[PDB]
Design a protein around this ligand. Structure first.
Ligand SMILES: *[C@@H]1O[C@H](CO[C@@H]2O[C@@H](C)[C@@H](O)[C@@H](O)[C@@H]2O)[C@@H](O[C@@H]2O[C@H](CO)[C@@H](O)[C@H](O)[C@H]2NC(C)=O)[C@H](O)[C@H]1NC(C)=O
Ligand SMILES: *[C@@H]1O[C@H](CO)[C@@H](O)[C@H](O)[C@H]1NC(C)=O
Ligand SMILES: *[C@@H]1O[C@H](CO)[C@@H](O)[C@H](O)[C@H]1NC(C)=O
Ligand SMILES: *[C@@H]1O[C@H](CO)[C@@H](O)[C@H](O)[C@H]1NC(C)=O
Ligand SMILES: *[C@@H]1O[C@H](CO)[C@@H](O)[C@H](O)[C@H]1NC(C)=O
Ligand SMILES: *[C@@H]1O[C@H](CO)[C@@H](O)[C@H](O)[C@H]1NC(C)=O
Lengths: 146, 311, 207
C-alpha cells in the first residue's frame, strides 16, 4: 500500500477519534491542559517530538482507558490500537525500528486514584486525550522525524 | 489534602445550599483570600457568591439551583475549590431532586371508591429511589394548609400496563379531608412533595344518564327528547345535548340546558324525516366534578309529519 | 455488507436461494482478522473463528458484528458440512471503512431568492465520515406525480447551491443524498423533503 494512503487513513482515523470524543456529554467545555495535581501520570502538557515517546503516550492512554467498561471507551481503545498499528507501519516505512513498549509499571496508585476521583479520573483524561489528538494531527502536518 | 464539608447534600428544586472547603498544598495552608470555585470543572462560579468564615476556610452558596440531568453512569454534579490554577482531584457531590408530582384522584358516582393515579415520568433524574404515598385523614373537610401534619400512615399502590401507579381508596367518607402527598425516599434521606387536599364531594363523577329517546313531533315540527335523571348525585345540575344526522361521520352541534328540574326541551330542525343520533352529558352547575361519559345513541323514526302544501 | 452510519456496527448476510436445492448440509460462518489490511495475494488461512448468528424471516442469514475496528480487514467465508465431509467457500476480504453508509443530510432548506429569480438550497453535511463527500440533489414541482431532475455537486466545501427554474409560482420539493467522494461506499438515504413558500419575488412585469 502507498505511504500516502496510509497517511490519509491515519488522518481520517484521527479526525474520527476526535469527533467521537467530542460526542461525549461529559466533555462539553473542559479545555485540554488543566493543572490537576493528583493527575500527573496522564500524558499531556509538554509536547511530543519523537516516535518512541509518542508510542509510549499511546500505550499509557490505552492502559488508562482499559480500566473503564463503557462501550464508547472500548471503541476508542480499539481505534487507538489501530492508530498504534498504523504508526508502527509508518515508522517501519522510514527505516526506523520502533520496539513495542508497554505502559508504566507503577500505575497501581491509579486504581486508588480512581476510588478517590473516578469521575475526574475519566473526564480530564478524556479531555487530555482529545488535546493530544489535536496535536496528533498537527504532529503529522510537519513531517516528524524518527 | 483538601477537605470538604458537608460531603453529601440532598435538596429539592428551588432551595439554597452552602458548601465549605479547606485547602492545603506544599506543606502549607493556602489563605482563604485566593480560593475560587468550579462547577463540574466546566463553568466558573462568580466571585459574588463567595464567603469567608475563617482565616483559611472558604464558603460558597448556590442560588435557584437547577435539575441535575444524568450523564452516563454518573448522576450527580461535582463542586471543586482551589487556588489560582492548580486544583485537587477531590470533589463534593450535589444531588437535586424534582419533588413536585401531580397526583389525580377521582370519586366514583356510587360515592364508595376513589380511583387515584399518578405518573412517574419525572423520576428520570435519579432512579433507584423509593416512592411512597402518605395521606392524612381529617374528620373536617380540608381547608387552608397550616403546616405539615406530623401524624402519617402509609398505603401501597400497584403498577398497571400504562406505567402510571394506581391505587383505590375504599371505604371513603363524604365530608372528610384526605390530605395526601408523595415522598421520595433514598439511601441519603428523604424528601416530601407539596401536599394536596381533595374534597370527596368536589371531584365526584356523575353516572351517565341512560334510556335517552328522541322523536320528531307530529304537526309541531319540533324535536322531543325524553329520558330520566341519573340517581347520583341528587343535587341540582345542568344537562348538555349533542345531536346530528346519523352516519359514518356526523356534524354535531352543542346545546345546553341549565334547569335541573327541566325534563325535556323542544327545538325545530330544517329537515323533516332524518335519522338522528342524540347524546346527553350531565354536570353540576358550579364547575365542581368531572364530565360524565356519553350515553347510548338514540334514534328516531321516518314517517310523514304534516299535509303537503304542494302536491 | 456495510457499517452503520454512526460507525458502531457492521452487519451482513449471504444467499441460500439457489443453495436450497442442495439441502441436508449444515452451514456456518468463519471469520479471520488481519492486522491492518485484508490482503493483496490471498492464501488459505489455517486459523479461523466461527461466528454464531441467527436467521431472518425473508430467508437471509442476518449476522451482526459488534464491536468492530475501522481499519482492520476481515476475511470471511462459509463452511458447508455434509455427512461425508466438508468444503469451504471462496474467502472474501472486507474493510469496514470502505463499506460505510453515511447518514442522510440534516436541516435541508429551500427558498426562492429575492430579486434574483433563482431557487437556492442549503444543507449540512453528516458528522460521519470525516472524508470528502459528494452530493446529489433531486427536485421537482410538488404534486401527486413529479417529474424531478437530478443534479450533482463535486465540491466538498460547498453547502449551498442555486439553480434556475422555469416557473416561479409553484411549490417545489427538494431532496439530497450524499456519498463518499472516492466511491468506496454505498449511497445514503434521501434527506427530509423540504417545501418552499409561495411569495412575491420581483416587481410586476406588465400592467
Ligand atoms: C434562596 O435564596 C433566595 C434569595 O435570592 C437572593 O438573595 C439575596 C442574596 C439577594 O441577592 C436577593 O435579591 C436574591 O433574591 C430567596 O429568595 C428570596 O427569599 C426571601 C426570604 O424569604 C423572600 O423574602 C424573597 O421574596 C425571595 N425572593 C423572591 C424573588 O421571591 C429564596 O426564598 C431562598 N430559598 C428558600 C427555599 O428559602
Ligand atoms: C436553570 O436553567 C434555566 C433555563 O433557562 C436558566 O435560565 C437558569 O439560569 C438556570 N439556573 C442556573 C442556576 O444556572
Ligand atoms: C424510607 O427511608 C427511611 C429512612 O429514613 C427508611 O427507614 C424506610 O424504611 C424507607 N422506606 C422504604 C424502604 O419503603
Ligand atoms: C369517559 O371519559 C373519560 C375522560 O374523557 C375517559 O378517560 C374514559 O375512558 C371514558 N369512558 C369510557 C368507557 O370510554
Ligand atoms: C460434518 O458433518 C458430520 C455429519 O455426519 C458431523 O458428524 C461432523 O461433526 C461435521 N463436521 C464439523 C466440523 O462440524
Ligand atoms: C433508510 O431508508 C430505508 C428504506 O428502504 C429504511 O428502511 C431505513 O430505516 C432508512 N434509514 C434511515 C437511517 O433513515
Amino acid at each position: 500500500v502507498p505511504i500516502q494512503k496510509v497517511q490519509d487513513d491515519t488522518k481520517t482515523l484521527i479526525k474520527t477519534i476526535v469527533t467521537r470524543i467530542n460526542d461525549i456529554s461529559h466533555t462539553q467545555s473542559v479545555s485540554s491542559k488543566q493543572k490537576v495535581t493528583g493527575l500527573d501520570f496522564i500524558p499531556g502538557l509538554h509536547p511530543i517530538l519523537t516516535l518512541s515517546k509518542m508510542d509510549q503516550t499511546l500505550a499509557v492512554y490505552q492502559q488508562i482507558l482499559t480500566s473503564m467498561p463503557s462501550r464508547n471507551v472500548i471503541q476508542i481503545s480499539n481505534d487507538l490500537e489501530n492508530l498504534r498499528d498504523l504508526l508502527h507501519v509508518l515508522a517501519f516505512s522510514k527505516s526506523c525500528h520502533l520496539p513495542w513498549a508497554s505502559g508504566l509499571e507503577t500505575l497501581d496508585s491509579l486504581g486508588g486514584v480512581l476510588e478517590a476521583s473516578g469521575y475526574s479520573t475519566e473526564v480530564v483524561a478524556l479531555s487530555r486525550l482529545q488535546g493530544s489528538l489535536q496535536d496528533m494531527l498537527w504532529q503529522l502536518d510537519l513531517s516528524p522525524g524518527c | 489534602d483538601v477537605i470538604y464539608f458537608p460531603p453529601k447534600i440532598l435538596t429539592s428544586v428551588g432551595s439554597n445550599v452552602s458548601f465549605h472547603c479547606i485547602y492545603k498544598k506544599e506543606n502549607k495552608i493556602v489563605p482563604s483570600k485566593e480560593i475560587v470555585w468550579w462547577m463540574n470543572l466546566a463553568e466558573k462560579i462568580p466571585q459574588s457568591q463567595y464567603d469567608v468564615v475563617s482565616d483559611h476556610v472558604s464558603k460558597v452558596t448556590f442560588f435557584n439551583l437547577n435539575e441535575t440531568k444524568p450523564r452516563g453512569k454518573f448522576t450527580y454534579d461535582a463542586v471543586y475549590c482551589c487556588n489560582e490554577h492548580e486544583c485537587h482531584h477531590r470533589y463534593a457531590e450535589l444531588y437535586v431532586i424534582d419533588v413536585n408530582i401531580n397526583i389525580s384522584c377521582e370519586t366514583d358516582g356510587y360515592l364508595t371508591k376513589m380511583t387515584c393515579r399518578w405518573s412517574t415520568s419525572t423520576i428520570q433524574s435519579l432512579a433507584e429511589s423509593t416512592l411512597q404515598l402518605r395521606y392524612h385523614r381529617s374528620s373536617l373537610y380540608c381547608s387552608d394548609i397550616p403546616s405539615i401534619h406530623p401524624i402519617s400512615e402509609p398505603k401501597d399502590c400497584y403498577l398497571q400496563s400504562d406505567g402510571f401507579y394506581e391505587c383505590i381508596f375504599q371505604p371513603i367518607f363524604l365530608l372528610s379531608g384526605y390530605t395526601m402527598w408523595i415522598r421520595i425516599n433514598h439511601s441519603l434521606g428523604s424528601l416530601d412533595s407539596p401536599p394536596t387536599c381533595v374534597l370527596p364531594d368536589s371531584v365526584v363523577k356523575p353516572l351517565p344518564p341512560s334510556s335517552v329517546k328522541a322523536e320528531i313531533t307530529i304537526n309541531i315540527g319540533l324535536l322531543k327528547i325524553s329520558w330520566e335523571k341519573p340517581v347520583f348525585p341528587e343535587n341540582n345540575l345542568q344537562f348538555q345535548i349533542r345531536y346530528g344526522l346519523s352516519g359514518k361521520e356526523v356534524q354535531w352541534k352543542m346545546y345546553e340546558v341549565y334547569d335541573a328540574k327541566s325534563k325535556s326541551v323542544s327545538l325545530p330542525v330544517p329537515d323533516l324525516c332524518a335519522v338522528y343520533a342524540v347524546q346527553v352529558r350531565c354536570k353540576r352547575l358550579d364547575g365542581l366534578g368531572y364530565w360524565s361519559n356519553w350515553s347510548n345513541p338514540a334514534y328516531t323514526v321516518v314517517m310523514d309529519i304534516k299535509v303537503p302544501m304542494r302536491g
